[PDB]
């Protein structure tokens, strides 16, 4: 059911026991940190400070890797969620101090912070009361410790909407000898944001896209959709016309100017495409395909000037071998 | 409503680009001469009235969420120009209307008490600060205790530019 099988469990242990580089900027001593070690000690020092953790989860490219290695979503980002009950203004400070009391062990909080920390964002608004710490790595591999009390709905694809509760596995780590075999394997529960975990995993199996909360479609939603489309995730949706109309509309609303478009495509080509080459040019033509075929409210001159911005960039990719 | 942002993985060119972007706003600001008794940025007292208040928080939180992308270190300065220096943007207008660059003797006290509010544990303050010692683009919008009740007023953006 929701309970992970063995091979999934072994892969989960994989990306969480295999170390990550904490590259050195300013203070140069790099740090080989095993994700399991940080997840444990963070949860521990948090519960020790009487904060009250509900669940520690895993999200995105990683959980979609442990469930089904076949799908294109490659484990290149470790997204860790710490579902908890943080309400006091000081609760976020001691969460900060816990993560920094943890990264000194593996080697003053302010200095370690200014060295290896990429981002520290805390949002206390109408529905979002979450905190985030992104540890830096020169290889672009990104680790995100997200401590989320309450979080608004978001535009979610099926195959990206996966969350696996690491708590049953954490127990096996504090026992001296990790007591893990095919027979003694922690029952780990996988879950989905998009909806029924049975539905969502099936989508992951046979390369289908499907959405929920299209009300919260973001500007760049069209871009990420073609990334699924370029990764063989064909939308079986025959409601794809509306969806494509839905995301194209918001892309040109949020990025009305042509120069503002070029900057977004230049960045998405640069960052969101790593270790990919024909994929870049393929991506540009499938975006072209979606725009020319599906959009339905771009002005005449706007349509051409956008489509021709894609073709120029595809020339740049071709011209670079 | 707190929203606090800290980014330290910034390039030296990104520091200079935001410094220049910030100092163009300083040119648009009248200086306080003969009226009174590395960090670069501004501190703006933002009364949370349902109009100008809510619109600004809309824009500030939207940019912060826009900065939570996987890397976005390049698109930072482009987004900052079109954010703090643009038109029909409740924030850029706030930075164009009542902006005052102040001398060191006044500005240091503000950066000091601001730092203490963000670290210790009223008036709503919207700030953006770049510091090099180590780049530290720190911005946010935090409910706190008075930092410059003496000279600052509602929707008045104080400029902190020191060495």
Residue numbers in the entry:
A (entry chain A): 63 to 169, 179 to 392
B (entry chain B): 57 to 93, 123 to 206, 214 to 225, 293 to 322
Sentences reproduced from the published study:
The FAM46 (also known as TENT5) proteins are noncanonical poly(A) polymerases (PAPs) implicated in regulating RNA stability. Here, we report that the nuclear protein BCCIPα, but not the alternatively spliced isoform BCCIPβ, binds FAM46 and inhibits their PAP activity. Unexpectedly, our structures of the FAM46A/BCCIPα and FAM46C/BCCIPα complexes show that, despite sharing most of the sequence and differing only at the C-terminal portion, BCCIPα adopts a unique structure completely different from BCCIPβ. A helix-loop-helix segment in BCCIPα inserts into the active site cleft of FAM46, thereby inhibiting the PAP activity.
To understand how BCCIPα binds the FAM46 proteins and inhibits their PAP activity, we sought to solve the crystal structure of a FAM46/BCCIPα complex. After extensive screening of various constructs of BCCIPα and the FAM46 family members, we were able to obtain crystals of the complex between FAM46A and BCCIPα-ΔS, which contains deletions in flexible loop regions. Strikingly, the structure showed that BCCIPα adopts a structural fold that is completely different from the structure of BCCIPβ published previously (see details below). The structure of the FAM46A/BCCIPα complex for the first time revealed the fold of BCCIPα. Furthermore, A DALI search of the protein structural database suggested that the fold of BCCIPα is unique, as the search failed to find any protein with substantial similarity to BCCIPα. In contrast, while the β sheet in BCCIPα also starts with strand β1 at one edge, the strands are arranged in space in the order of 1-6-5-3-7-4-2. However, in our structure, this region forms two β strands, strands 6 (residues 296 to 303) and 7 (residues 316 to 320). Consistent with the published structures of FAM46B and FAM46C, FAM46A in the FAM46A/BCCIPα complex adopts the same bi-lobal structure, with the PAP enzymatic active site residues in the cleft between the two lobes. The N-terminal lobe contains a large β sheet that is covered by several α helices on one side, whereas the other side of the β sheet faces the catalytic site cleft, presenting the conserved catalytic residues, including Gly122, Ser123, Asp139, Asp141 (for binding ATP and Mg2+), and Glu215 (the catalytic base), to form the active site of the enzyme. Our observation that BCCIPα can promote the nuclear localization of FAM46 is consistent with the structure of the complex where the NLS is available for driving their nuclear translocation as it is not occupied by the binding interface with FAM46.
